[PDB]
């Protein structure tokens, strides 16, 4: 994993400063990942969920740590809370919860075998 | 006479309190939400226009935070004025 400073404006100041590429969506540069994640800016600025910005960024700009050389996904609870807040508002504007953001794919909190980020 | 100063002093302290008005953070959040609502109804979720608006909103947020920073420097200055004014009495 090669760490690179996060340059995506939406993902700055989220709790960590370094990310790696490619992400799970096979984006090769932050410019490519940035262009997609920025489309979600109205949902972030409307504040349907306090957890939305961290959840989105934790996938498009996954955290990179010099000591922990392993992908660290968001805890499932982070995804579920973001879905609870924003999915109804998205649904009201004709958009379903994106398939790449399905919460079942993420590890649960407190599992001794796999670590995840929760706040 | 010296007790008039203390009456004048609190008026300075009272007026100094009003000087660092700030209060912009509450109004800013409503404005950004209003733009986000418009953005949603316009269907931004055309794509190029949406990206520029968000970039402008972040600069606006920086401007608001910048304005808030100077307000704190004002509050730092009103404190220092109260300090030296108290030194005579």
Q: Which residues of B touch A93 (CB under 8 A)?
A: 40-41, 43, 45
Q: Which of B33, B44, B54 to mutate to test the interface with A (most CBs of A within 10 A)?
A: B54
Q: What is the resolution of this structure in A?
A: 3.2
Under DSSP, the state recorded for B47 is H
Listed in sequence order, the residues at least 6 apart from A50 whose beta carbon sits closer than 8 Å to its beta carbon are: A81, A85
Three-state helix/strand/coil letters over A3-69: EEECCCHHHCCCCCCEEECCCCCCCCCHHHHHHHHHHHHHHHHHCCCCCHHHHHHHHHCCECCCCCC
Q: Which of A10, A34, A42 to mutate to test the interface with B (most CBs of B within 10 A)?
A: A42
Q: Which of A34, A41, A53 to mutate to test the interface with B (most CBs of B within 10 A)?
A: A41
Which of A35, A41, A46 is the closest to B37 by Cβ?
Answer: A46
Phi-psi region of B68 (alpha: psi -120 to 50; beta: other; left: phi over 0): alpha
CB atoms within 10 A of CB B60: 14
How far is CA A60 from each of CA B8, B60, B70, rounded to the nearest angstrom?
59, 25, 35
Which of A42, A45, A47 is the closest to B45 by Cβ?
Answer: A42
Annotated binding-site ranges of A for hexadecanoate = 39-46
Asked if residues A84 and A49 have their Cβ atoms less than 8 Å apart, the reply is yes
Interface of A with B in 49-88 (CB under 8 A): none
Q: Taking the domain A1-119, which CATH number applies?
A: 1.10.2000.10
Q: Does B15 touch chain A (CB under 8 A)?
A: no
∠ CA A61-B28-B48, nearest 5°, is 50
Burial letters A85-97, b for 16+ CB under 10 A, else e = bbbeebeeeeeee
Q: After which residues is chain B broken (C to N over 2.5 A)?
A: 45
Give dist(CA A82, CA B44) in Å, integer: 20
Give dist(CA A55, CA A34) in Å, integer: 14
The residue length of chain A stands at 119
Q: Which residues of B touch A90 (CB under 8 A)?
A: 45
State whether A41 and B50 contact (CB < 8 Å): yes
Give CB contacts under 8 A, 24+ apart, made by A78-81. Answer: A78/A51, A78/A54, A78/A106, A78/A116, A78/A117, A78/A118, A78/A119, A79/A55, A79/A103, A79/A106, A81/A49, A81/A50, A81/A51
Domain residue extents for chain B: 1-89
Q: Is B59 exposed, middle or buried (0-12, 13-18, 19+ CB in 10 A)?
A: exposed
């Amino acid at each position: 994993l090669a760490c690179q400073e996060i340059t995506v404006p939406l993902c700055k100041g989220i709790g960590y400063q370094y990310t790696y590429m490619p992400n799970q969506f096979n984006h090769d540069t932050q410019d490519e990942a940035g262009l997609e994640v920025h489309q979600f800016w109205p949902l972030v600025e409307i504040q349907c969920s306090p957890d939305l910005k961290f959840f989105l960024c934790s996938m498009y700009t996954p955290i990179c740590l010099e000591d922990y050389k392993k992908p660290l996904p968001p805890c499932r609870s982070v995804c579920e809370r973001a879905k609870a807040g924003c999915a109804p508002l998205m649904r009201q504007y004709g958009f379903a919860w994106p398939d790449r953001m399905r919460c079942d794919r993420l590890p649960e909190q407190g599992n001794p075998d796999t670590l995840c980020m929760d706040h | 006479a010296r007790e008039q100063l203390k009456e004048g002093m609190i008026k300075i302290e009272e007026q100094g309190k009003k000087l660092s008005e700030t209060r912009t953070q509450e109004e800013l959040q409503k404005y950004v939400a209003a733009v986000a609502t418009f953005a949603l109804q316009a269907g931004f979720l055309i794509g190029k226009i949406s990206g520029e608006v968000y970039l402008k909103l972040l600069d606006l947020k920086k401007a608001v935070r910048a304005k808030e920073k100077k307000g704190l420097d004002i509050l730092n200055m009103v404190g220092e004025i109260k300090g030296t004014l108290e030194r005579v009495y």
